[PDB]
Amino acid sequence: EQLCLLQEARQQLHADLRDKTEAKKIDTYCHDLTISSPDICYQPNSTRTPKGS
Amino acid sequence: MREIVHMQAGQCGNQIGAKFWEVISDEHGIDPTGTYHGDSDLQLERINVYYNEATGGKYVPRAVLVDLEPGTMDSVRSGPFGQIFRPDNFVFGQSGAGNNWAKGHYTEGAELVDSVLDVVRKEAESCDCLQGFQLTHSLGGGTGSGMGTLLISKIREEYPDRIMNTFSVVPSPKVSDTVVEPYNATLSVHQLVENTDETYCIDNEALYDICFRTLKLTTPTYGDLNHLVSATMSGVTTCLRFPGQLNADLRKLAVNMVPFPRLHFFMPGFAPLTSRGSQQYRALTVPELTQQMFDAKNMMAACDPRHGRYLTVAAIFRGRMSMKEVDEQMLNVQNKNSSYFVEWIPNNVKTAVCDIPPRGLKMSATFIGNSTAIQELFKRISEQFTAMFRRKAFLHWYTGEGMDEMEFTEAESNMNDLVSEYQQYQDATAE
Amino acid sequence: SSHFSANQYKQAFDSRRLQNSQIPQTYKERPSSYEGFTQIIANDRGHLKQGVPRSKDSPWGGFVGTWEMPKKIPGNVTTYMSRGDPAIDNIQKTRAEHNEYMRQAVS
Amino acid sequence: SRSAGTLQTTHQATYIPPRLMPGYKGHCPTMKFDYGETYGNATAKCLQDY
Amino acid sequence: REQERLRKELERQQIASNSRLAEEQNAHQNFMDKEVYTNPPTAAYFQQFNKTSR
Amino acid sequence: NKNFVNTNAVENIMSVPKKPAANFVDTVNGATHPLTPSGLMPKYVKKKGYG
Amino acid sequence: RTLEQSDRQIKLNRGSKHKLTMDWSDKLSAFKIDEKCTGLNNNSTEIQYKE
Amino acid sequence: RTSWGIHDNTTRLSNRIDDIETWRETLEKTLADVDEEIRKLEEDKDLAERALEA
Amino acid sequence: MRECISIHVGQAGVQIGNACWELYCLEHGIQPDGQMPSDKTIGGGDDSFNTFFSETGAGKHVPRAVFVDLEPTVVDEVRTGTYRQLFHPEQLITGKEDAANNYARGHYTIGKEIVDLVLDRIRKLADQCTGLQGFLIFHSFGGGTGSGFASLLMERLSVDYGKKSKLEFAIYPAPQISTAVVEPYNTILTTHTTLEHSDCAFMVDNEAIYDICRRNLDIERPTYTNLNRLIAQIVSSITASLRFDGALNVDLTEFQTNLVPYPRIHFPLATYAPVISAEKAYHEQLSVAEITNACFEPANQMVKCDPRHGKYMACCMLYRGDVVPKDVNAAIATIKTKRTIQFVDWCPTGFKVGINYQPPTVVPGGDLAKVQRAVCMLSNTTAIAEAWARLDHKFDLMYAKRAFVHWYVGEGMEEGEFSEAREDLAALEKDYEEVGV
Amino acid sequence: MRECISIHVGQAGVQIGNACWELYCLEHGIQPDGQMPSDKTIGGGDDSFNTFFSETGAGKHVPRAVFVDLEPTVVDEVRTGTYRQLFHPEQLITGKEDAANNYARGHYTIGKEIVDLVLDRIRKLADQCTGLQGFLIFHSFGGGTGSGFASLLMERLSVDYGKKSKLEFAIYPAPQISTAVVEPYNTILTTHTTLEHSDCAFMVDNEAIYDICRRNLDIERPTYTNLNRLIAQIVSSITASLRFDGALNVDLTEFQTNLVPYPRIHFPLATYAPVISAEKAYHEQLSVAEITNACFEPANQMVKCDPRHGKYMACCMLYRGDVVPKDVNAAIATIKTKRTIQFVDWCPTGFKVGINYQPPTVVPGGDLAKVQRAVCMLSNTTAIAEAWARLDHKFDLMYAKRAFVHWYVGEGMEEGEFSEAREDLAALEKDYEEVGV
Amino acid sequence: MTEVLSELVSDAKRHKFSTIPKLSDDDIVSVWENVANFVERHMALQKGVQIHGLGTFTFTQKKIDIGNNKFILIQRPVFVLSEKFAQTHRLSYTKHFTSGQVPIVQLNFAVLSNESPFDRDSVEGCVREVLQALSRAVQSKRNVEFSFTGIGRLTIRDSKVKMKFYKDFLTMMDG
Numbered sequence A: 001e002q003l004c005l006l007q008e009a010r011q012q013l014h015a016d017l018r019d020k021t022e023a024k025k026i027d028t029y030c031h032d033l034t035i036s037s038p039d040i041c042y043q044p045n046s047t048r049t050p051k052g053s
Numbered sequence B: 001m002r003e004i005v006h007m008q009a010g011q012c013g014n015q016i017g018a019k020f021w022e023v024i025s026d027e028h029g030i031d032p033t034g035t036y037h038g039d040s041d042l043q044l045e046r047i048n049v050y051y052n053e054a055t056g057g058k059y060v061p062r063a064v065l066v067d068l069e070p071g072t073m074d075s076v077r078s079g080p081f082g083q084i085f086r087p088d089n090f091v092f093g094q095s096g097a098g099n100n101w102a103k104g105h106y107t108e109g110a111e112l113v114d115s116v117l118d119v120v121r122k123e124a125e126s127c128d129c130l131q132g133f134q135l136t137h138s139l140g141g142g143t144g145s146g147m148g149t150l151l152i153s154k155i156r157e158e159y160p161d162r163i164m165n166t167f168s169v170v171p172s173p174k175v176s177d178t179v180v181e182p183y184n185a186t187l188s189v190h191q192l193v194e195n196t197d198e199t200y201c202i203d204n205e206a207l208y209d210i211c212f213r214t215l216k217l218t219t220p221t222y223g224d225l226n227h228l229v230s231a232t233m234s235g236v237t238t239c240l241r242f243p244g245q246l247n248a249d250l251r252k253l254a255v256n257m258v259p260f261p262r263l264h265f266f267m268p269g270f271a272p273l274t275s276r277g278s279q280q281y282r283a284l285t286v287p288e289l290t291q292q293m294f295d296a297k298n299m300m301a302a303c304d305p306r307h308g309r310y311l312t313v314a315a316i317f318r319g320r321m322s323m324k325e326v327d328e329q330m331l332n333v334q335n336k337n338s339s340y341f342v343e344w345i346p347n348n349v350k351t352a353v354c355d356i357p358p359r360g361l362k363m364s365a366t367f368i369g370n371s372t373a374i375q376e377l378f379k380r381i382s383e384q385f386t387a388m389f390r391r392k393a394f395l396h397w398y399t400g401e402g403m404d405e406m407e408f409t410e411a412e413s414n415m416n417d418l419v420s421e422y423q424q425y426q427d428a429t430a431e
Numbered sequence C: 001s002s003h004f005s006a007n008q009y010k011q012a013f014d015s016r017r018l019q020n021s022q023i024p025q026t027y028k029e030r031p032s033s034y035e036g037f038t039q040i041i042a043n044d045r046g047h048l049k050q051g052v053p054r055s056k057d058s059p060w061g062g063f064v065g066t067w068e069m070p071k072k073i074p075g076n077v078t079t080y081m082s083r084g085d086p087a088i089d090n091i092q093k094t095r096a097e098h099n100e101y102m103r104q105a106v107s
Numbered sequence D: 001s002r003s004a005g006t007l008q009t010t011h012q013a014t015y016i017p018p019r020l021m022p023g024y025k026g027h028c029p030t031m032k033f034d035y036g037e038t039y040g041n042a043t044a045k046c047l048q049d050y
Numbered sequence E: 001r002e003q004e005r006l007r008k009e010l011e012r013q014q015i016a017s018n019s020r021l022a023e024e025q026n027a028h029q030n031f032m033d034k035e036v037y038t039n040p041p042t043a044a045y046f047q048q049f050n051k052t053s054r
Numbered sequence F: 001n002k003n004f005v006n007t008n009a010v011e012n013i014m015s016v017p018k019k020p021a022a023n024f025v026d027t028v029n030g031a032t033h034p035l036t037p038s039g040l041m042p043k044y045v046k047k048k049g050y051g
Numbered sequence G: 001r002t003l004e005q006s007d008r009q010i011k012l013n014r015g016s017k018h019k020l021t022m023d024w025s026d027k028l029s030a031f032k033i034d035e036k037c038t039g040l041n042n043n044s045t046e047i048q049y050k051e
Numbered sequence H: 001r002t003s004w005g006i007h008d009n010t011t012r013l014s015n016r017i018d019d020i021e022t023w024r025e026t027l028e029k030t031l032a033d034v035d036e037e038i039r040k041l042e043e044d045k046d047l048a049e050r051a052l053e054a
Numbered sequence I, J: 001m002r003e004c005i006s007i008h009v010g011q012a013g014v015q016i017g018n019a020c021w022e023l024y025c026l027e028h029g030i031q032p033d034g035q036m037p038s039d040k041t042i043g044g045g046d047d048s049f050n051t052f053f054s055e056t057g058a059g060k061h062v063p064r065a066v067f068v069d070l071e072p073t074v075v076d077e078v079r080t081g082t083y084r085q086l087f088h089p090e091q092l093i094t095g096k097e098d099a100a101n102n103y104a105r106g107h108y109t110i111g112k113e114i115v116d117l118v119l120d121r122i123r124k125l126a127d128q129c130t131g132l133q134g135f136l137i138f139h140s141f142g143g144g145t146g147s148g149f150a151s152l153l154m155e156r157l158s159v160d161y162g163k164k165s166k167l168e169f170a171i172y173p174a175p176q177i178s179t180a181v182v183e184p185y186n187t188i189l190t191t192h193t194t195l196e197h198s199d200c201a202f203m204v205d206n207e208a209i210y211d212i213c214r215r216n217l218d219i220e221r222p223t224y225t226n227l228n229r230l231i232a233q234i235v236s237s238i239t240a241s242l243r244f245d246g247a248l249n250v251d252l253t254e255f256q257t258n259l260v261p262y263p264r265i266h267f268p269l270a271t272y273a274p275v276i277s278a279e280k281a282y283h284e285q286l287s288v289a290e291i292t293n294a295c296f297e298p299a300n301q302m303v304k305c306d307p308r309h310g311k312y313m314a315c316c317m318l319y320r321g322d323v324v325p326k327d328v329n330a331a332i333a334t335i336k337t338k339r340t341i342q343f344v345d346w347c348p349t350g351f352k353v354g355i356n357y358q359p360p361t362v363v364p365g366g367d368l369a370k371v372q373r374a375v376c377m378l379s380n381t382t383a384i385a386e387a388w389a390r391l392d393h394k395f396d397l398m399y400a401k402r403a404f405v406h407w408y409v410g411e412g413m414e415e416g417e418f419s420e421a422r423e424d425l426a427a428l429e430k431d432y433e434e435v436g437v
Numbered sequence K: 001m002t003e004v005l006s007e008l009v010s011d012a013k014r015h016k017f018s019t020i021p022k023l024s025d026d027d028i029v030s031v032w033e034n035v036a037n038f039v040e041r042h043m044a045l046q047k048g049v050q051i052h053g054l055g056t057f058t059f060t061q062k063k064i065d066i067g068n069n070k071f072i073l074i075q076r077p078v079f080v081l082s083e084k085f086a087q088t089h090r091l092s093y094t095k096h097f098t099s100g101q102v103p104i105v106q107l108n109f110a111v112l113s114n115e116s117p118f119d120r121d122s123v124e125g126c127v128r129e130v131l132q133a134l135s136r137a138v139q140s141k142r143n144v145e146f147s148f149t150g151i152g153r154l155t156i157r158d159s160k161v162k163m164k165f166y167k168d169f170l171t172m173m174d175g
């Protein structure tokens, strides 16, 4: 009974940690973006706030 | 936000309603837990018509399951889509019915009706528009007939401005399965004609015939019967849940189909219904759906459309289609078989079009017919009733549970003069 | 309660010119003249005194809601031309019924 | 309790200072300066009333 | 003509500010609908039953 | 053996029209509210003992 | 294996959306260039002797 | 205000990178704590279960 | 300045209003957001849109329409999709219970629930209007809201607004195709109450346009979108002279004066020409005389009443495009010399011409081919007496046994209204007989 | 020297003032701690706050208010809230034990233990201000502190200050919605002693505010916070003429002289227009003509009554923002030419306008929108005769068999006071009828 | 004030268009006498007569449990208005808490036509036209006092319905 709970707590943390590592990948990509970067342009909406924010 | 309260009485009514909520939960993409798992928002706009919000994204059906035998209550709780229902609106008794209309009406069936009406009142004033009440049962047993008619009378006494549509499985004589079913049917048709203002009579022999010819169906059992009944249950209220080119709800169908108040027993149908071997030989076209609606063997009320004259015909289509094609087909049927139509009503067809087909099919159709051929099943019930009332058979049960023979005479006289009213309106000159 | 004219500017201040497509209410244009020492004909309460020619209209004004309008409306023909004599007669009949029911509802 | 978040009145929920007035989901997304805390465990009551 | 253009630009500024306030107010309304005004009972509401044998 | 065609048309001639519901809506979405209790219909100014 | 395939389709979708936003941003900026050009008349104050 | 505007949000993005790492490291250590705890519990599950045939 | 208020009541009215305001936005260059594509100066800067669209302080075009229905499905479908930001949400009135094909439900029940709110929205729009020209009321003579609430609303409009123009666009039940069953009952009861509170009612059925789409457009199975697009073209050709400069301008106050010879005779027909597709217009040289002959042909009529069976009273010809008044005059002269077209003896001057220079716009992905000239043909003829006689025969067949009367009475209308309505249209029927001689 | 003393009696008054001083300090740029920021956001001295805020030696801006209640926790949550440093400590006066919905307990037993202290505090504030212009008493007619102690307080203010103006903001009980059973007793007991000791009492109904928030702001489930924000905007629009600049400005002595015809008919009605949210405020005209048409509307009154079923006496109109006198004039002219409004016979001139320049200030967390125009309309109509007659009927239902009278008898008051209150309000009914005659 | 004798029966007899013009003013009164005896004899055996029309005659059982298998019952016969007629004519019914432990029987045309020298086609019209005439009297705003002789009088004064039960009925139906 306890091993199934300990497995379940591992499964919650691993799904959380997988989100943290590649959210840092997003934020590092935004941090390294500069004025002279070629992947930089006007956006259609940009300043929207998505649902689940 | 017009919305319908569903009630289901007896084993037959409970199984039909379980299949009905299964079908209209597939139509809205709702899992048996209660969450919405669909793809489009069209399945989510009018989800309040049949489902009530719970905490989170849970959708609890607005259904009341009533029975005097707890075994069917356990069966419909533990069967497919049994988790969707609320355990509080599972009011039951632990006595039984015994296929006795007197026991279901004037005895312990009337013990349960207090809690039954409490549950239905809770669901009814949990509303905001409350389109009407929709009941399913059978006129063959005790709880289906007696208790069902008791709920019909009480709900009509409470809210006599709401659309009350009941379906009811009428007994066929060549299916039998009960010896007191003419008594149970005659004692309940009186309450049906007097109180209910929309009735879609369904017959088990017609269902079996549809399964055995139009669907082959080597062993249909009671699953396919309730499946077809659920198809016609969804096809009459599809326009409340989905938008369309020409909308028509239960009140509009009742207005356009019922000429006189005690003239409201219908002949439902569905299309397409294609066998597996003939699946690839068939192309779904609006004339093909119109023909399969206007085919005699496709009927679900054991009447023959050629054996009578239609008064009014409601035709509810589903899917993307052409209004011109629909209108020319529904005019061409009137122009072709004009002899099977009353001439004192021009345009004997109400037409509705909804552009949201069921999951799977691209087009589908639903027939509702206020034919005067509905009198033949009532005549069969009346002749079996007088056959087993000539010698006063099986009356000791009803007199023990508290009825006199005068109630049986009222039931026979009301059924006889209702059939005579059908015959008189059927054999009427134009003007 | 006093829409007492504008002389040169009566061409303006019209309901048609100030975006009021509804029919307008007729106040008394062209003010009159008096002599002086008007009677007080009241008290310090809002009363009308005894012997004053009190009106017979409703103190709360004349207005009818939707659920007390007549079920039938004549239609404001105001023409009485190219119609038959029974048409003229029953148009007068519905006009009289309209006026009577509005008068009864106001009073 | 702490876990249910039920000790907030209507006045404390709505009458927040105007410099931080347009909050999101009943919080202040910019006024937040305490991150990464480890000392403190949530007991059975805290995890049951969450 | 410059006064008319200034009036129209002031109107446009008001529209932009009202659009930001509108998205904030819609977020607040959705927050108060899907949260706050809901009552799902937790385990502590049922824990306080059957905790005494007497 | 009564003539149902005649004995339905008779009360179709001379059955009772019901009084329409004295209520109103204002939300551009429905939301029917009764008008007689409400605040809009004047009845207490009539009363019997207003003065 | 399906998770690593679904991660590829996410980057392909956002890669293709990025190429659209390359083109759409060029249309907005070209719209503003033609926006000031259409408004130029003889009495325009914008106007200039230039090579 | 434009040159300082980019620099202000570059530090805000850099603050969030350090903000995730304060929680990404603690969640990584708890996974090592859970994995060690699972390994210890499976051995002690086996020890009592090997005592069943004893 | 030439403001018009469009009240779309019923499902038919709301769908026709969708197809109308789409064409109006395409004409005036309005996106489905309410904004000009370019700035205030270029690509616009005019004030030609104020007949239909009012302008807020920022430059957002919002329509002068009031969408009314008692069911919520169609109005919510308008509220959520494409033109979701164009239409005003307070001008999208909907209710809970529909009238369910019942004149008396739409007249005394739920129709009377909403009329205060509808008149409030209408008077707000009229206060916005600064030179209002009239009300274009789009409805059907079918069932429910299009009959009962439309008749009640027009009664209230006649009560409060005086003698303002109240032009109906009415979907008349076709002689063979008809959807509802109680449709003759509703049509009798609504024409009885809209005989007096009306100025003019353009009568546009569905079966004639079905035959037109089969024969001239080769669709062979059209739908409500195509039907409402043709109706939108009709109303655009009618209202064009209030927005576009022309040789002969026609305003909304003129149609009653030039199409109503006698009171209670205010039901003219409608026809659009040249309604034809591109692969057929490739082979044609479409000119003024040809499209006038197409208008007077008894197959392009958009109501199934052939003019061979009656006499014309009035004839409004709205020419629209690169049309020349010389060829207009020649075409009308040769129509007058033509004998199959028959005009009544007491009307030597039976024609009224309105010429507008704006070419007929085309909806992208539409049905109609682009042409340089078009005619809105608007005739008041005695051939509609056949349709009135057929509908009265249907009413008498339904009313001899008095089926479907218990619904109306048991939810609130007196049964004497049926008899007085049938008497009113019998008087109308004799009126058409006496006008025809 | 345009100072105003704001008294807030009862729970309703305390919460209304809690939402009100928020809006005042946001308008005047005063921080929640009471310290005005050192330059960089404000210009110069800028002593426009002096009408509501005084200047201590520490630079703190303490308001000219008094929050008085016969209960803890309701003023104590203010003392422990976000404005704990803005209010003086004994400025906020609390009792120990409730009057508890009892006029007798709030007027004869518990009120005469705190009335002396609140009079002393009012005396200190009045001695501090040198241009004392009036009192603003915010209370409710639900009863307890809001009725008994408010009546006692106004009775002592009448003899202490004499002819100084005393405006009231009274939360009148709703017709069908009631949070207390004994509300008719409390309201009719306080509206027998208020009449000879008042000047003008604006009348606000919670159910009407609920309906306004439901049909305009699109909040389907509003809250007392939203209510008190609306009354805060009303009183801000009233007092903006004292703090800000305008074309023609309205003194507090205007509100008695230009609004009440007779000494005991001093119950006018507030109305705010527009009251629209930001989701729909981008999509209307915000014109002064439309906001006048909206404030002259039964669907936008702050009290649940129909003004079309009665005659107006006076209308004090505070136009606030970017308004111009001629568009104001044309709006008033078209209202005077409307049908549904009928003025009373003896009052030719029934309007009094005040044009201000400062636009309304929006709270960032409220429900309203940033607009350039607003109208606070104060209407003295005869439609409150229905409300007074309803109160008299609800009094006569209970008092016919001496229900709930033993509490009032035992708690100081005698039996006859109910009879004199009933006779006084019957005389008020007769006055309201004979004025309309 | 409007009784049942000599006005409603006369209107239902002449009644311009009538199903039953042959039966006399004594006969329509006697068939409602039979209806009254029918309602009496079925309510005596703890049942309730429901007529589609006016309404339903039931009880209000006031059952207080004494203890040791004893109970005191206060019985009161009540007449609940049919809600269809109440909504049609807007009469303010008196709501009565009626339990479902009362068997409910419809009006028995077979019983009313058995001992009568008449038939079903006449006994059905004898109640339908009387309900229609009572509805016409409600339209006419005349004070209706429609009698149920042997039971009580149903009074419609001004938008209100109340039934006064007779003393003998109230003392032999109480149990």
Ligand SMILES: Nc1nc2c(ncn2[C@@H]2O[C@H](COP(=O)(O)OP(=O)(O)OP(=O)(O)O)[C@@H](O)[C@H]2O)c(=O)[nH]1
Pocket: B245, B246, I009, I010, I011, I012, I013, I015, I016, I070, I071, I098, I099, I100, I101, I102, I139, I140, I142, I143, I144, I145, I146, I147, I171, I178, I179, I180, I205, I206, I224, I225, I227, I228
């Ligand atoms: N030309 C055209 N006619 C339509 C359209 N939709 C509905 N109709 C007509 O409307 C009739 C059906 O009645 P409706 O007008 O829709 O009824 P309603 O106004 O919505 O009121 P209810 O009966 O309560 O639903 C049909 O006979 C059609 O002829 C449409 O989109 N185009």
Ligand SMILES: Nc1nc2c(ncn2[C@@H]2O[C@H](COP(=O)(O)OP(=O)(O)OP(=O)(O)O)[C@@H](O)[C@H]2O)c(=O)[nH]1
Pocket: J009, J010, J011, J012, J013, J015, J016, J069, J070, J071, J098, J099, J100, J101, J102, J106, J140, J141, J142, J143, J144, J145, J146, J147, J171, J173, J178, J179, J180, J206, J224, J225, J227, J228
């Ligand atoms: N508009 C508005 N009214 C309120 C508010 N809070 C309370 N009320 C009104 O106050 C009435 C009840 O009287 P209270 O103000 O609560 O009581 P009190 O004046 O403090 O006197 P006590 O009853 O002795 O405590 C209710 O009917 C409400 O209408 C509020 O926040 N806004």
Ligand SMILES: Nc1nc2c(ncn2[C@@H]2O[C@H](COP(=O)(O)OP(=O)(O)O)[C@@H](O)[C@H]2O)c(=O)[nH]1
Pocket: B009, B010, B011, B012, B013, B015, B016, B097, B098, B099, B138, B140, B141, B142, B143, B144, B145, B169, B176, B177, B178, B204, B207, B222, B223, B225, B226
């Ligand atoms: N079509 C159909 N008929 C059924 C079903 N179950 C039972 N019946 C019929 O119902 C009749 C008996 O009714 P019953 O269920 O006993 O009614 P109850 O006593 O109230 O539960 C039998 O003649 C069956 O033919 C079903 O699932 N579908």
Ligand SMILES: [Mg+2]
Pocket: B247, I010, I011, I069, I070, I071, I098, I144, I145
């Ligand atoms: Mg509709």
Ligand SMILES: [Mg+2]
Pocket: J010, J011, J071, J144
């Ligand atoms: Mg309090």
